[PDB]
Amino acid sequence: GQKVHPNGIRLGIVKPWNSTWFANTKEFADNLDSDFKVRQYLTKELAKASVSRIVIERPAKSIRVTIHTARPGIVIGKKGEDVEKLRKVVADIAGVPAQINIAEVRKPELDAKLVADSITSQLERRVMFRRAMKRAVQNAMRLGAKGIKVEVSGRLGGAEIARTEWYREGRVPLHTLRADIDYNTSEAHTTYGVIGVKVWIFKGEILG
Template sequence: MGQKVNPISFRLQAHKKWDSRWFAPKKDFAKFLIEDDKIRNAIEKRFASRPTIDRVEIERTENLITIAIHTAKAGVVIGKGGAGVQELKAQLEKLVSLPVRINIEEVRRPELSAKLVAENIAHQLERRINFRRAVKMALQNVMQAGAKGVRIEVAGRLNGAEMSRREKFSEGSVPLHTIRADINYHGARAQTAAGVIGVKVWINKGERND
């Protein structure tokens, strides 16, 4: 089962929480879901040139949508004098049916974010850096940041090889069935000249008792 279940959804009842938090009547559910997807896609596209966005949390009330953007580089998102946030707010309000409020929260240790690590490796692969070098540097940085364990998988035509293959790298302990283990997971895609290379990252931050 540990091979098939997303580690985050597997722990939702224990210590993880949904990134979209709202209730809606049946007639509005599909509309709100599509709006959330548009919000996430717009934010990811705006900052796609380099990995900066860790996660986007969305909360709805009757007359407001609150968007919390967790980022490794708050200055890039906020922009000069807050101009970046205002532009983003105006862009998002064109996509949704309610006014938008944006909160920027800085990620203290980006090395412990599976999304940022996966996207960083994917960007390096797109720049034709050797996959072993990129992955081993990521493993080293994650462990130095205080993780209990990390596991990284890359799959595809690695280094432009004729045959696609899957390579796995790990350090420390990454338990798949221990629900109290705080596992952060993300999958990213690198679009290379040889084809798409998939990158999956699991980071074990230790056990939680709350």
């Protein structure tokens, strides 16, 4: 615990924010609480569908949610059977009219959240941590990424003593801010305890 969050340190330069709405002191707390509620609802409902990111905006006292996911067909439904329900519940929670947008995440193996969730699912399904890490690293390195690092910590293999294992392939410069670093974490709850997974992906430096 001596490392800083790359996504939090690259907010100003490269990485965008997950919430681009404006308010004042009187509304900031309420907006953050509503965003937390809707994010908790979405991450609990769309668990099967590979969901990557949720951006929230509040223009003209209305809420615009944009879900970047890898399974738009099952996220939406047959002809709007689930997206309409999601819009209705989001509008009911926020007290304002809602507009939901869907974005497709091409190359799902290059997204930190999806890979971390897959690793967590495999760990809770009793798949080998080393095998999962090697498969994920190889897939992410062959689909066109310039570097990947995967770390797994805590009660590996049902042992009585925790440990921290990790794999690296390529280059993952964390001290370079202009570098396009995608980082995320995940937690698996197995009968032997809790296991933490962290993923860093490098997508090339940015100029501008």
